[PDB]
Design a protein around this nucleic acid. Structure first.
Length: 270
DNA sequence: CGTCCATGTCTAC
DNA sequence: TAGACCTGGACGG
């Protein structure tokens, strides 16, 4: 998952858990290296917000719930496979690694953090990752300024296909979005990032870093992902113009990750 | 059986 | 920077 997936996951949690009351402990699969979540409430609601490639749950005990408890924030990163799913308490998926259980009345449900591969991670802090750039979806002006102010940074020596994955400046952009973005402007992926950015100091590279992932969010669906039917997944595959599409060339950036492009690879190519 | 590939970090050398 | 962290699917023989 990349920014749009984290965003729709946030929306999924909020819409699904609007009318739900949770109760009891927050349960961790005994194979997850991530920390135990010390939290018990007789009655609590669950809300979410997203910032680039991170999502924040807030667990909010209701009035008079017991034990006396202050709200608790957890921040998730999903790595290659994470996901959130509302399931029947007795049909936990394989790889439901963290699990929030509905109190009665109503049919017993588990909001599960599902992460097949265990590249996902969570922290008790409630805080966004120190160093991560602003969210390209929700802090666009902040995102734009945070780049143009810092072209001096060695980050921008790298080729543009590489800089776009540095979450310090492009929080929320990942390997499908970088491909999709450059294709829209036909910027060679191994053009030097400083050259392409110095220019702006008919939409431009930074406009698209916002608007292109925002197109994924406005499919509905779960962006690149199977939930909301294996119907919405094909609605994404049809949106894609570059990433994996027949006809397109592809190469490995200096860190093994595959960039899909059309035509000219550009000057700093392997 | 086997090999390779996948929406991302994270860290040891 | 090579390597680690993981599982499973789409392919090969």
């Amino acid at each position: 998952p990349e920014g749009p997936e984290l965003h729709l996951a946030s929306q999924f949690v909020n819409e699904a858990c609007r009318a739900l009351v949770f109760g009891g402990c927050v349960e961790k699969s005994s194979v997850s290296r991530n920390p135990e979540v010390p939290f018990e409430s007789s009655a609590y609601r669950i809300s979410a917000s997203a910032r680039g490639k991170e999502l924040r749950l807030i667990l909010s005990p209701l009035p008079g719930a017991q034990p006396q408890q202050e709200p608790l924030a957890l921040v998730f990163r999903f790595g290659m496979s994470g996901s959130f799913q509302l399931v029947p308490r007795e049909e936990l998926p394989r790889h439901a690694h963290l699990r929030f259980y509905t109190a009665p009345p109503g049919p017993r449900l588990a909001l599960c953090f599902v992460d097949i591969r265990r590249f996902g991670r969570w922290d008790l802090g409630g805080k966004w990752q120190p160093g991560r750039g602003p969210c390209v979806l929700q802090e666009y002006q902040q995102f734009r300024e945070n780049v143009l102010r810092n072209l001096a940074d060695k980050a921008f020596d790298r080729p543009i296909c590489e800089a776009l994955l540095d979450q310090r400046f492009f929080n929320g952009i990942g390997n499908y979005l970088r491909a999709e973005i450059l294709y829209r402007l036909k910027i060679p992926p191994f053009e030097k990032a400083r050259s392409v950015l110095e220019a702006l100091q008919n939409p431009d590279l930074l406009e698209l870093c916002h608007s292109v992932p925002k197109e994924v969010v406005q499919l509905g669906g779960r962006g690149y992902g199977s939930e909301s039917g294996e119907e919405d997944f094909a609605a994404f595959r049809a949106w894609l113009r570059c990433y994996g599409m027949p006809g397109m060339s592809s190469l490995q950036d200096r860190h093994g990750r595959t960039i899909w492009f059309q035509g000219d690879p550009g000057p700093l190519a392997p």
